[PDB]
Scaffold this active site. Sequence first.
Site, PDB file in Angstrom:
ATOM      1  N   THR A 180      -0.489   0.828  -9.085  1.00 27.46           N
ATOM      2  CA  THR A 180      -0.494  -0.627  -8.896  1.00 27.46           C
ATOM      3  C   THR A 180      -1.552  -0.928  -7.884  1.00 27.46           C
ATOM      4  O   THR A 180      -1.558  -0.316  -6.858  1.00 27.46           O
ATOM      5  CB  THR A 180       0.865  -1.143  -8.426  1.00 27.46           C
ATOM      6  N   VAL A 184      -3.452  -4.174  -5.835  1.00 24.82           N
ATOM      7  CA  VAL A 184      -3.655  -5.573  -5.488  1.00 24.82           C
ATOM      8  C   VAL A 184      -4.669  -5.549  -4.332  1.00 24.82           C
ATOM      9  O   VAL A 184      -4.382  -4.961  -3.315  1.00 24.82           O
ATOM     10  CB  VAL A 184      -2.382  -6.277  -5.057  1.00 24.82           C
ATOM     11  N   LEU A 202       0.814 -13.027  -2.697  1.00 22.69           N
ATOM     12  CA  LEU A 202       1.084 -13.821  -3.863  1.00 22.69           C
ATOM     13  C   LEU A 202       2.139 -13.236  -4.742  1.00 22.69           C
ATOM     14  O   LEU A 202       2.377 -13.766  -5.824  1.00 22.69           O
ATOM     15  CB  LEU A 202      -0.206 -13.970  -4.680  1.00 22.69           C
ATOM     16  N   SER A 225       4.748  -7.261  -7.510  1.00 22.69           N
ATOM     17  CA  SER A 225       6.030  -7.376  -8.156  1.00 22.69           C
ATOM     18  C   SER A 225       5.880  -8.050  -9.508  1.00 22.69           C
ATOM     19  O   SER A 225       6.538  -7.642 -10.462  1.00 22.69           O
ATOM     20  CB  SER A 225       6.904  -8.289  -7.266  1.00 22.69           C
ATOM     21  N   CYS A 261       3.934   5.504  -9.493  1.00 22.20           N
ATOM     22  CA  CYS A 261       3.375   4.637  -8.494  1.00 22.20           C
ATOM     23  C   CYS A 261       4.328   4.492  -7.306  1.00 22.20           C
ATOM     24  O   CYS A 261       5.500   4.130  -7.494  1.00 22.20           O
ATOM     25  CB  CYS A 261       3.103   3.186  -9.140  1.00 22.20           C
ATOM     26  N   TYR A 270       4.376   2.044  -5.187  1.00 19.27           N
ATOM     27  CA  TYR A 270       4.910   0.701  -5.114  1.00 19.27           C
ATOM     28  C   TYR A 270       6.142   0.562  -5.997  1.00 19.27           C
ATOM     29  O   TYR A 270       7.174   0.000  -5.588  1.00 19.27           O
ATOM     30  CB  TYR A 270       3.873  -0.342  -5.532  1.00 19.27           C
ATOM     31  N   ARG A 326      14.259  -2.865  -4.537  1.00 18.69           N
ATOM     32  CA  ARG A 326      14.458  -4.296  -4.368  1.00 18.69           C
ATOM     33  C   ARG A 326      14.939  -4.979  -5.621  1.00 18.69           C
ATOM     34  O   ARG A 326      15.364  -6.135  -5.565  1.00 18.69           O
ATOM     35  CB  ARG A 326      13.207  -4.932  -3.862  1.00 18.69           C
TER      36      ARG A 326
END
EC number: 2.3.1.-
Length: 95
Positions: free
Chosen positions: A38, A40, A47, A51, A72, A74, A82
């Site tokens: 992932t 970003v 932002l 997710s 990954c 993340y 979560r």
Amino acid sequence: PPKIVWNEGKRRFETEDHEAFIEYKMRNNGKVMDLVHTYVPSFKRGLGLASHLCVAAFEHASSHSISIIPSCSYVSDTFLPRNPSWKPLIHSEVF
Ligand SMILES: [Br-]
Ligand SMILES: [Br-]
Ligand SMILES: [Br-]
Ligand SMILES: [Br-]
Ligand SMILES: [Br-]
Ligand SMILES: [Br-]
Ligand SMILES: [Br-]
Ligand SMILES: [Br-]
Ligand SMILES: [Br-]
Ligand SMILES: [Br-]
Ligand SMILES: [Br-]
């Protein structure tokens, strides 16, 4: 939510501007999606994109009856803990 597209040619779900993405590798005759990375960029942080990218990939896998490897960090360290309702999508041998 931000528009996420599926770029099969780059094995990724991505923002439309291509700047943030989640990449995968398919395994076992298309039955397993290994979410490998992932990304970003710093200018796009805050932002919720990581997710949202994960949700796009998980929805794709769920819709297609594909299991996921959360390779990954993340996905494994942040998204899944979560969002435990997505845990059933994870290949059982992973956890
Ligand atoms: Br965006
Ligand atoms: Br975009
Ligand atoms: Br692939
Ligand atoms: Br495959
Ligand atoms: Br099999
Ligand atoms: Br495939
Ligand atoms: Br964020
Ligand atoms: Br993010
Ligand atoms: Br998350
Ligand atoms: Br949840
Ligand atoms: Br849990």
